[PDB]
Design a protein around this ligand. Structure first.
Ligand SMILES: *[C@@H]1O[C@H](CO)[C@@H](O[C@@H]2O[C@H](CO)[C@@H](O[C@@H]3O[C@H](CO)[C@@H](O)[C@H](O)[C@@H]3O)[C@H](O)[C@H]2NC(C)=O)[C@H](O)[C@H]1NC(C)=O
Ligand SMILES: *[C@@H]1O[C@H](CO)[C@@H](O[C@@H]2O[C@H](CO)[C@@H](O)[C@H](O)[C@H]2NC(C)=O)[C@H](O)[C@H]1NC(C)=O
Ligand SMILES: *[C@@H]1O[C@H](CO)[C@@H](O[C@@H]2O[C@H](CO)[C@@H](O)[C@H](O)[C@H]2NC(C)=O)[C@H](O)[C@H]1NC(C)=O
Ligand SMILES: *[C@@H]1O[C@H](CO)[C@@H](O[C@@H]2O[C@H](CO)[C@@H](O)[C@H](O)[C@H]2NC(C)=O)[C@H](O)[C@H]1NC(C)=O
Ligand SMILES: *[C@@H]1O[C@H](CO)[C@@H](O[C@@H]2O[C@H](CO)[C@@H](O)[C@H](O)[C@H]2NC(C)=O)[C@H](O)[C@H]1NC(C)=O
Ligand SMILES: *C(N)[C@@H]1CCCN1C(=O)[C@@H](N)Cc1ccc(I)cc1
Ligand SMILES: *C(N)[C@@H]1CCCN1C(=O)[C@@H](N)Cc1ccc(I)cc1
Ligand SMILES: *[C@@H]1O[C@H](CO)[C@@H](O)[C@H](O)[C@H]1NC(C)=O
Ligand SMILES: *[C@@H]1O[C@H](CO)[C@@H](O)[C@H](O)[C@H]1NC(C)=O
Ligand SMILES: *[C@@H]1O[C@H](CO)[C@@H](O)[C@H](O)[C@H]1NC(C)=O
Ligand SMILES: *[C@@H]1O[C@H](CO)[C@@H](O)[C@H](O)[C@H]1NC(C)=O
Ligand SMILES: *[C@@H]1O[C@H](CO)[C@@H](O)[C@H](O)[C@H]1NC(C)=O
Ligand SMILES: *[C@@H]1O[C@H](CO)[C@@H](O)[C@H](O)[C@H]1NC(C)=O
Ligand SMILES: *[C@@H]1O[C@H](CO)[C@@H](O)[C@H](O)[C@H]1NC(C)=O
Lengths: 728, 728
């Protein structure tokens, strides 16, 4: 009877998955925009009430908003006219609306193309970056004070990151931080003067007669990296006829020595800030906790307050060293690190002592610290049921590491095994976000009573919608490789036959510290491949993956393209041992690093895979950026690791592609994995006499994210997989 | 029984078609390279002597790619270190060899990276371009003397064409012209200052960490074109401590009025030069025969000596206006222009009388004037058998235009219907080149008795091989469209069997004045397609084609992408309704203009074609260069032809692509038809939700001619074709 999940279902998001985004604005109240009106919900009394109606969002372009209400609740910031740039970065326009007089501020408006804006932590101060320079507004109707005058396109960024810092270090565009009471505003300046430029054509609209050339300061492996400086402005003296009072905090000697990176900024107190630096190698990190000298206005550093974290078996942290979470008095902090066993656990440090005390242990890892009060610490880990692909919220008593309780494990054990949490201030309440394995579920809770104050979103609407369709099922199991058990998952077609034979599709990412296998509910292209095309879609996290301890994650240090690729084969090999797999029809695919591994596996000449598809794949690590590549492969010089760079390019394996049907896809405007990568790859194959297929996407970036492109690629990839599989 | 001409035979040229390349150097002697020796033959006598032993090459420390002997037979130029640029342009290194003392002149050498070099018509002077400047060397062993100082990269070219003059007007990279006795040295200077730059990426070898951005001053439709200046230099006063004596010849005012092009330079005598200019709108052209004034050094022009040529139905010439052929004395010249009946024939002009007299007439055309003596004039036309796709050599008596003799018609009426010739210095002898339909045949003839002195090359070898292989047959014929007789050709598969239904592939170019239907013998991809895959390959010349009169050719003036594509469809539709054609399997493919035409047809929704391949297609004329585009479309403004520009793009037909299988190939380093053109086309298709196949070629250009690429694209297109035709 009932239907199957169709490609059109997937491409037209006909089966919507709802979520519940809120914005805490006190230890017990939060804002939520419904339809278009911001409502203020009180978590302590359960009552709510419109904060400002739908009738104030005057569309000044096309669509609108995202909002930000000043901590003092006297003003509200409205963003619209959003112009996307890189992954996190973009420009937009802002309008400040007075919540008192209840009028839109027209005098001293915020510039068109602001790159970043933000309220001070308290009161209603503003600090924004426009044309790479920092400006501050003590009042929404006053004139801003220019803080920096060095701003310069493609060269000097003040308050916002350059391309590589946005992407591989901060995972954000923002590079300014207000101090708790708004006394100080800290920021970072990036200098790209010596950073080479990546360049590519961007054809624009059909009517543009000459293509334009995009130029971006992008450091590829080995290249000259951008430098950085850090400053702390004392906003108290900001006046139109006064000078900007500031101080430059320089990194510690152990780091100044050579090329380094600024990777973390944490305000401990108004008089204390914490900076986290890392040498360019990324196996030596350090935390420098600076104190404000009242009598001189300078932030003094101290050996007693510095904390070195290093890695002798790989790199520090997962994707970057863990951030420290300071206590209120700032005299001590907690930060995740690797223990003697190689597992990521919480360690307790005292601001001025170098030895710490782990407050957790186990054959599991703390995913990240979430909230900290004077009595408890709330964190996320994959301990529960020993599944590295699960996430639960836990609370541990600071005065007895014995009293640890799981606050989410048994709320809905079958439907919910993957949470993320969002606490209020002082952490007296929290939103629980459940992403699977069952339909997503958002609920609010009290921290004291641990009770479920209410259901914010249950997706019951999607539940109905789905009971009428033949959904596939997702199973997570285990196989052993090298005496170790690695997890895998398979999306199984509806009424999963049994011993009958189905074509297999490995969906791989496998980048370092990644995790493709999990209990997150997803409605993806695989869902359709299984439900409608009856294709099994497996995934496997072998060596290099994360969340299972450094032993597994650092297996690929300095040798990407080896184990993670090899394990994808060994596992698919076993998958074919199983009787429901049609070994004559096994394919593989992946995007980005998944594109790389897809290609490397297809280039292995293992005889196991029939066809593959790589999308925006890395092909030669020397083409990728410094921060990411150098973290796992070191420098591409003969005195360092140039050898493993050389033998891990996809081109080196071109002759074997003759044994498989290959589909290579890239977006011509990929600022991330430059189209260049695929250009050098197809050339090698051409030189090698290998037939394959191609698909370029004019002006699409790393995401091939436009609607038309999105639908095109999957439709195009679908026909390919079906052809290779002899499917109608 | 016998094998078939296989795809591999075509790609690796297993079957070589020999030819014979000689260089005349007198009226009875020509140079010929044999087994790497330069031999000097003697016409009539037939004997030959070693002019330079191949042992001379081996002593040189490099691969001598080309040679040139001084007209006085004392020196020989050795071209090596060749480095191709555009279609004609390229730089090289040169060594001058002293034939008398048999040494390699090693002092005051020619610089490396020479853009162009050439001997004076007599003696052994040299003129060369280097760094966009002109240098003159009187003696091989003496310092050269600089002539221009303005030469600047991508902006000022002295003695060599810029991108657009090379490709569109001169079909050459040289812009130098020695006078008959080498007294003067005429040269054009090109200013690209205000011409926009086309920018694209060149990836180069894998080791290149960052791609290189290529930039060419390239004028696209309606854009600022480069400007030009002509100059005659009196080399006699050339001395290190002396300025340069030069006069700038400006075009007649009727042309100077606005944007113009210099499209011809012909020396008549040592004191008379003929320049040919054209207006940006190529429907007005004028010849200005200038005389040297000994008392001033000026080159004076006179209204009497000016001949205006214009078209009311299209543009002047076939691609450019025919060039004037002057008489020894210089008082009269012969040039091809259009009849009052629209047919291109030879008109006799008086150097100072505005009227001329047509010495030839009919419903056929003269392709070109080959030689001119004081009694006879030799030309090539397609009159024989009223076959527009044929070529023969004719001789006409200047004293009586009634006696015309066809020198090639009856030499091999069955094997040779397409010739081209080469005459000795005074036309005392001529080499006839027979390119089809039989195997190419080169022969030597004496202008006196017109008897065949000997067979230079008959390809007897090739003839022996092919008899042992099932070669397909090529039949030319006619059909009627719009009440006219348009020619076509079909490469029929071996042992053709009317009654049985073959798949049909239409190979099309269709560019204005083009000719796909001819009698030239060609070992092509179609040969393989028909001999092996049993697919019929046909070509059709409809409206817009050339060599059939202006009424046919100018039909698409100002409306490119209409009648000619419309004529391809009507024609196929007829072939479709024939018996031996399986209308359920008809494809069409093409390159450049052909690619554009293939696309416009596929997107016409005429339902005739199943699939199509487009290689480096034009997609929107505003993207192509001005000289060529503006010649058939005029200017892309609302006051001109902007409207036919607008509805002639391929994008505007993107939707109809939902009805056909389409392959889109394009070199990413195509400087001629920019990649942008396909980039824009795919984007349109993707935005129209249409699925198609793509294939980019890293760094290949318009010809996609590297040996590896060349093979890949034909193997690729072969697969695609076989799929679509349901062929195993
Ligand atoms: C430099 O030039 C000399 C010519 O003086 C080249 O010698 C030629 O070498 C070829 C190959 O060994 C000879 O070809 C032979 O021709 C006979 C016909 O008489 C044929 O039966 C054989 O099958 C073979 O093809 C050729 O006779 C000989 N010189 C002549 C008479 O043309 C020499 O090869 C050249 N050196 C190089 C490497 O360029
Ligand atoms: C690059 O070369 C290294 C060195 O040979 C390869 O490492 C070896 O791989 C083989 C086959 O998988 C193993 O049996 C050896 O034990 C490895 N030796 C060492 C020293 O590690 C590596 O696999 C190659 N990597 C790529 C990208 O092909
Ligand atoms: C090439 O053409 C440019 C104009 O496109 C010439 O530049 C002009 O030079 C004159 C005198 O040097 C100035 O008065 C003008 O202002 C310039 N025009 C512009 C807009 O640049 C240039 O001189 C030409 N080059 C040569 C050597 O002929
Ligand atoms: C020579 O070509 C020009 C350039 O196209 C002709 O003039 C244009 O004619 C079209 C219509 O045919 C008009 O739409 C344009 O506005 C005209 N532009 C100009 C500058 O006149 C011109 O008529 C042709 N000369 C002749 C009469 O043969
Ligand atoms: C561009 O638009 C013009 C105007 O409609 C088209 O010209 C006419 O096309 C129809 C269809 O062939 C004919 O019946 C008319 O005789 C054409 N002539 C004119 C002047 O109207 C033209 O075909 C379109 N070109 C393209 C490439 O689509
Ligand atoms: C594709 N996955 C591509 C090539 C490997 C690295 N790639 C990225 O896009 C990364 N920048 C992803 C990423 C982002 C942020 C962090 I911290 C870590 C990885
Ligand atoms: C493809 N054939 C492309 C688009 C039409 C013009 N094209 C060219 O490549 C031409 N530049 C070829 C050409 C060159 C010189 C003359 I005179 C005429 C045509
Ligand atoms: C909720 O109701 C209480 C009264 O018990 C009131 O003090 C408060 O203002 C209300 N808060 C909201 C969010 O409406
Ligand atoms: C504004 O909110 C109301 C609900 O109170 C809703 O009915 C209306 O459609 C919304 N208009 C929009 C889309 O801004
Ligand atoms: C940026 O760095 C360059 C050195 O590469 C230096 O000359 C310049 O002063 C720096 N700019 C700033 C504002 O720090
Ligand atoms: C700041 O200086 C400007 C002119 O330099 C002056 O108009 C203004 O009054 C000064 N600010 C104050 C309030 O002193
Ligand atoms: C950190 O990495 C560098 C660069 O690869 C290496 O030379 C250095 O010895 C490492 N330090 C360690 C492992 O402590
Ligand atoms: C042909 O050329 C040779 C020199 O290679 C010469 O000896 C001979 O006399 C010439 N033949 C005649 C008789 O003209
Ligand atoms: C000019 O010629 C004279 C000959 O008298 C020579 O001595 C002088 O060096 C020359 N000057 C140059 C190098 O232009």
């Amino acid at each position: 009877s009932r239907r199957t999940y169709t490609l059109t279902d997937y491409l037209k998001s006909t089966f919507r998955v709802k979520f519940y985004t809120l914005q805490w604005i006190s230890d017990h109240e939060y804002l939520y925009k419904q339809e278009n009106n911001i409502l203020l919900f009180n978590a302590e009394y359960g009552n709510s009430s419109i904060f400002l109606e739908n009738s104030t969002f005057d569309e000044l372009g096309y669509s609108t908003n995202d909002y930000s209400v000043s901590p003092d609740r006297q003003f509200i910031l409205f963003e619209y006219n959003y112009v996307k740039q890189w992954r996190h970065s973009y420009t937009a326009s802002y309008d400040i609306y007075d919540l008192n007089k209840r009028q839109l501020i027209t005098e001293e408006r915020i510039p068109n193309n602001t790159q970043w804006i933000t309220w001070s932590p308290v009161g209603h101060k503003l600090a924004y970056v426009w044309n790479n320079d920092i400006y501050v507004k003590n009042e929404p109707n006053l004139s801003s004070q220019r803080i920096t005058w060095t701003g310069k396109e493609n060269v000097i960024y003040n308050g916002v990151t350059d391309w590589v810092y946005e992407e591989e270090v901060f995972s954000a565009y923002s590079a300014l931080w207000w101090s708790p009471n708004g006394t100080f505003l800290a920021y970072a300046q990036f200098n790209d003067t010596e950073v080479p430029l990546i360049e590519y054509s961007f054809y624009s609209d059909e009517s543009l007669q000459y293509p334009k050339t995009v130029r971006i300061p992008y450091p590829k492996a080995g290249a000259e990296n951008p430098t950085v400086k850090f400053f702390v402005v004392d906003t108290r003296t900001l006046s139109p006829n006064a000078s900007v009072t500031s101080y430059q905090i320089v990194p510690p000697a152990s780091v100044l020595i050579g090329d380094h990176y600024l990777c973390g900024v944490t305000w401990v107190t108004e008089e204390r800030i914490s900076l986290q630096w890392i040498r360019r190698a990324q196996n030596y990190s350090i935390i420098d906790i600076c104190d404000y000298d009242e009598s001189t206005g300078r932030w003094i550093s101290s050996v007693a307050r510095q904390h070195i974290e290093i890695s002798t078996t790989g790199w520090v942290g997962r994707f970057r060293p863990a951030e420290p979470h300071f206590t209120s008095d700032g005299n001590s902090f907690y930060k995740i690190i690797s223990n003697e066993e190689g597992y990521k656990h919480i360690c307790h440090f005292q601001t001025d002592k170098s030895n710490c005390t782990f407050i957790t242990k186990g054959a599991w890892e703390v995913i990240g610290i979430e909230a900290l009060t004077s009595d408890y610490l709330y964190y996320i880990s994959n301990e529960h049921k020993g599944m590295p692909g699960g996430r639960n919220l836990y609370r541990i008593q600071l005065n007895d590491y014995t009293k640890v309780t799981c606050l989410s494990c048994e709320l809905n054990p079958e439907r919910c095994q993957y949470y993320s949490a969002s606490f209020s201030n002082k952490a007296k309440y929290y939103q629980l976000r459940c992403f699977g394995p069952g339909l997503p579920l958002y609920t609010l809770h009290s921290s004291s009573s641990d009770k479920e104050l209410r259901v914010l979103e249950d997706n019951s609407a999607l539940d109905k919608m789905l009971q009428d369709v033949q959904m596939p099922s997702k199973k997570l199991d285990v196989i052993n490789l090298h005496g170790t058990k690695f997890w895998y998952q398979m999306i199984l077609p509806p009424h999963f036959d049994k011993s009958k034979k189905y074509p297999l599709l490995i969906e791989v990412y496998a980048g370092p510290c990644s995790q493709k296998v999990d209990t997150v509910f997803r409605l993806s292209w695989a869902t359709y491949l299984a439900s409608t095309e009856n294709i099994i879609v497996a995934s496997f996290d072998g060596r290099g993956s994360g969340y299972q301890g450094d032993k597994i994650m650092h297996a690929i240090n300095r040798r990407l393209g080896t184990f993670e690729v090899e394990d994808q084969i060994e596992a698919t090999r076993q998958f074919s041992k199983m009787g429901f797999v049609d070994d004559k029809r096994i394919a593989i695919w992946g995007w980005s690093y998944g594109g790389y591994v897809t290609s490397m596996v297809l280039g292995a000449g293992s005889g196991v895979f029939k066809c593959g598809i790589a999308v925006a794949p890395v092909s030669k690590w020397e083409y990728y950026d410094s921060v990411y590549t150098e973290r796992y492969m070191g420098l591409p010089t003969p005195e360092d690791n140039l050898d493993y760079y050389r033998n891990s390019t996809v081109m080196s394996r071109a002759e074997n592609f003759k044994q498989v049907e290959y589909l290579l896809i890239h977006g011509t405007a990929d600022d991330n994995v430059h189209f260049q990568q695929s250009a050098q790859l197809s050339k090698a194959l051409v030189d090698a006499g290998v037939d394959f297929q191609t698909m370029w996407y004019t002006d699409e970036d790393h995401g091939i994210a436009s609607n038309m492109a999105h639908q095109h690629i999957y439709t195009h990839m679908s026909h390919f997989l079906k052809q290779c599989f002899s499917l109608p």
